[PDB]
Design a binder for this molecule. Structure first.
Ligand SMILES: CNS(=O)(=O)c1cccc(C)c1F
Ligand SMILES: [Zn+2]
Length: 140
């Protein structure tokens, strides 16, 4: 579990969005595993605007933050998980590291701020759903 809280937006994995998220929907994309809902209180996070490929992610299934190198946002085919079939997922970055289903929503951060959230796992890789191209997250 986990979310990004930027301005009056809550960014979650689409597969973990709640009824309240869907009832207060701003934007969702299944191909990207992302959903954004509206918030009453303003949030503590800053979104990275950059092409970094080094950063740090939180792994709940280790209670640990790991430094990683990651691929740029890409169209990947993802093997079946507990929450999704084997399918192509867009705007996905891969790193070598530990990810189980409950790790989804962990933040990946670089020197410029939040890069994305854990979205895929397995075979010793961790995938992150990029959010850095979402420029409207920064206004309105
Ligand atoms: C098919 N590629 S993608 O994974 O959807 C993607 C990644 C990065 C930037 C863009 C605009 C994009 F289309
Ligand atoms: Zn950066």
């Amino acid at each position: 579990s986990g979310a990004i809280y930027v301005g009056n937006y809550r960014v979650v994995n689409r597969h973990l969005a709640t009824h309240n998220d869907w009832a207060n929907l701003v934007w969702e994309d299944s191909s990207r595993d992302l959903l954004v809902s509206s918030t009453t209180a303003q949030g503590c996070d800053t979104i990275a605007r950059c092409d970094c490929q080094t950063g740090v992610y939180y792994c709940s299934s280790r209670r640990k933050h790991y430094p990683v190198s990651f691929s740029k946002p890409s169209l990947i085919f993802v093997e079946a998980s507990e929450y999704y079939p084997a399918r192509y997922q867009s705007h996905l970055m891969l790193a070598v590291g530990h990810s189980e289903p409950g790790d989804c929503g962990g933040i990946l951060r670089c020197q410029h701020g939040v890069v994305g959230i854990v979205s895929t796992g397995g075979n010793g890789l961790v995938g992150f759903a990029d959010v850095r191209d979402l420029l409207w997250l920064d206004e309105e």
